[PDB]
């Protein structure tokens, strides 16, 4: 996998996915048909502002970190990756009806929808995904929903790190 989304390119360094469709339901009741990737993999996310070690599994960010030119910068290259893991939490994070579309009138798929979603708004994603302890070594350090950095806690899996 060499490929992109949200505007960061991924490059896959380990692991595999079988993609499997769902539909999923939102708060607001709207069916999203999804194509869930299944299994274990690891990427390099680089954008001109931010790049990240991604690892994740099936619906599961399992660790992202991020090192961004400034807060703005990460915190963009954090919702991608929050939508790019097809998270429980983030599609419950979803609010109203999702119905984007492109500069030629064509619905975004649905994984842009989510994204496009958050883009504009990430306070109600980064409040529901949780919060956990971290051990602060190597340089990482953690960021809070409201993007402080914090050397106790963090966005469960989100570290920032400039080493
Ligand atoms: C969640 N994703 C999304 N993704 C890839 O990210 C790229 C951008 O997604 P997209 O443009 O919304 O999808 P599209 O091109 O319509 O294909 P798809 O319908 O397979 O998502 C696609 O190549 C998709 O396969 C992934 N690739 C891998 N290896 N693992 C993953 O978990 C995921």
Redesign the pocket.
Known sequence: ?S???GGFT?K?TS???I?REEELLTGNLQTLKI???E?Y?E?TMVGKRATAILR?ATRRLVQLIVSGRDEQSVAEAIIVAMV???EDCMIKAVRGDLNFVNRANQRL????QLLRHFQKDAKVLFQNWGIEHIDNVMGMIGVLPDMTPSTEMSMRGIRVSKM
Do not use: A, L, T
């Open positions: 996998s490929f992109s989304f991924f896959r692991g595999s996915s993609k194509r869930v990737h299994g993999e990427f994740k790019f893991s097809q798929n649905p994984m842009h």
